[PDB]
From a paper:
One of the key active-site mutations occurred at position 50, which was mutated twice during evolution, first from lysine to histidine (HG3 to HG3.3b) and then from histidine to glutamine (HG3.3b to HG3.7), resulting in a novel catalytic residue ideally positioned for stabilizing negative charge buildup on the phenolic oxygen at the transition state. In all enzymes except for HG3.17, the unbound state is never pre-organized for catalysis as both Trp44 and Met237 adopt conformations that would prevent productive binding of 6NT. In addition, the His50 and Gln50 catalytic residues in HG3.3b and HG3.7, respectively, adopt a low-occupancy, catalytically non-productive conformation in the unbound state that cannot interact favorably with 6NT. Increasing rigidity at position 50 is expected when this residue is mutated from a lysine to a histidine (HG3 to HG3.3b), given the lower number of degrees of freedom in the latter amino acid.
Numbering used by the authors:
A (entry chain B), B (entry chain A): 3 to 303
Write the structure that this text describes.
């Protein structure tokens, strides 16, 4: 079973990565597969806000520490979870109505996580899921209380905390070039970067249905037209795991110079958040599926 | 699938349980199977010392809180994870050399966790894996620094923290009645209870190879001869998952009045610590295996 990370590096990319966490690495065959076949690990849950700061100032780092240590001991790159988003946000944060307080709470959360792992994390998702489907800004507690400058503030705070990290904005449903959300994030990132905001990358959280891989061949070039140094495919899975869909997504990254790599949202189907759609590259016996072998063949040519 | 928890309750027992945690409940089909078929949940990792007190006096409860909330919402009993053992132990604990200090650290760890969930946890494993295979006490930091009184102190502290909870000592390789460790824990528990130590249960961490189920029919009655109010089988798995092995373990519990129930160490084979031995009751597609149906039939006769 050849390594898709080694093959994608040979094509000039940085990594083929996977989401994982402590109890994945201690069960199944996940550790062995990640050691052999993937070049970068991401925290499935252990760096999100609900996991890391469940009460104000009460930081929970045991899970993230385990992942970072494991990655360093096994020579893997590390991607950092989402620092600022609304999903599963603890109630103590969404209850805050004072602009100064929330600004400092946001800054402290960013700075504390990034400082702890300073120099060890290749890229951080600083802001996630900030856009509505129509392309307007999603009305989260951060937008409602801080205002539109919360995105500039978050990225400026992150850059100061670890200047070595690549700083990403991330969203989903960026999979079609004709979708308003895709066009909107490009336009806003262009305008933020022109004003000096340090957005190094756009990460596309690519959760696809059967047959949607082909659209990424046109969407990813559009995302790259925003002019960020990097773009990436994040937390990829595909209902049905057709080889055609997976190969199309891989070729989209190969076709876009600034695409640095691809991360898949888990190793084996039974550990997927949508396991009934068997959407990953390894089956419930940890055997590589046809999609894995099709990626290998596509990368060899 | 018919519920083995309902069926074991119909035979006069308390529960058929399973180990789980937050990222199991949000992936695969684990939540649906636990809702339908199991009556108790245990924390796979979220209550061990490395997860809950990675620095002195500074506790991490996000993962454990999630599990406790989920269980209460879904009407499930909750078993508490091992409070005092040598596994998953942070280096700050194992570097302590003063008896008074380590005693206070141990008491504070016990009291803090048990107080937080006071009244919500049916069972706590207070001390785990305290015995060598020859029946002598394992030379852990607790034994080396405090001495053999650490076990009485741990149980007396636990009883004061939550008098409602059933307090267990737990160990593995208690699966054969002629094995030295089995008689040794009986000897010591009888002594401790005669000295008024509040040991309510012996929990047998039952990790079996093929064909070893038959021996539990003699070992579990021997464990029960120590006179604790309860015994249980914890974190059960069986290499090969033979119906004969699983049914023999179930019948050992049915044969022992004081055996309150059985907990299996996960739901589906790919999420096992020894997945290559396919040792659990559901396969990698979340289908019940022959051993599951054999338990169903055994409990109905």
């Amino acid at each position: 079973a050849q390594s898709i990370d080694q093959l994608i590096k040979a094509r000039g990319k940085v990594y083929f990565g996977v989401a994982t966490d402590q109890n994945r690495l201690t069960t199944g065959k996940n550790a062995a597969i990640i050691q052999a076949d993937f070049g970068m690990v991401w925290p499935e849950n252990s760096m999100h806000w609900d996991a890391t700061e469940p009460s104000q100032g009460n930081f929970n780092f045991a899970g993230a520490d385990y992942l970072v240590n494991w990655a360093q001991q096994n020579g893997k790159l590390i991607g950092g979870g989402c620092l600022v988003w609304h999903r599963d946000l603890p109630s103590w944060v969404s209850s805050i109505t004072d602009k100064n307080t929330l600004t400092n709470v946001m800054k402290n959360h960013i700075t504390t996580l990034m400082t702890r792992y300073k120099g060890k994390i290749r890229n951080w998702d600083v802001v996630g899921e900030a856009f509505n489907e129509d392309g307007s800004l999603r009305q989260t507690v951060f937008l409602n209380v801080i205002g539109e400058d919360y995105i500039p503030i978050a990225f400026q705070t992150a850059r100061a905390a670890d200047p070595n990290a690549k700083l990403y904005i991330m969203d989903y449903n960026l999979d079609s070039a004709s979708y308003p959300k895709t066009q909107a994030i490009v336009n806003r990132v262009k305008q933020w970067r022109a004003a000096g905001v340090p957005i190094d990358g756009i990460g596309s959280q690519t959760h696809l249905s059967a047959g949607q891989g082909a659209g990424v061949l046109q969407a990813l070039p559009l995302l790259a037209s925003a002019g960020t140094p990097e773009v990436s495919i994040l937390m990829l899975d595909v209902a049905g795991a057709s080889p055609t869909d997976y190969v199309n997504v891989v070729n989209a990254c190969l076709n876009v110079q600034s695409c640095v790599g691809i991360t898949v949202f888990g190793v084996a189907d039974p550990d997927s958040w949508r396991a009934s759609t068997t959407p990953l590259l390894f089956d419930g016996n940890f055997n590589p599926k046809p999609a894995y072998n099709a990626i290998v063949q596509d990368l060899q040519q």
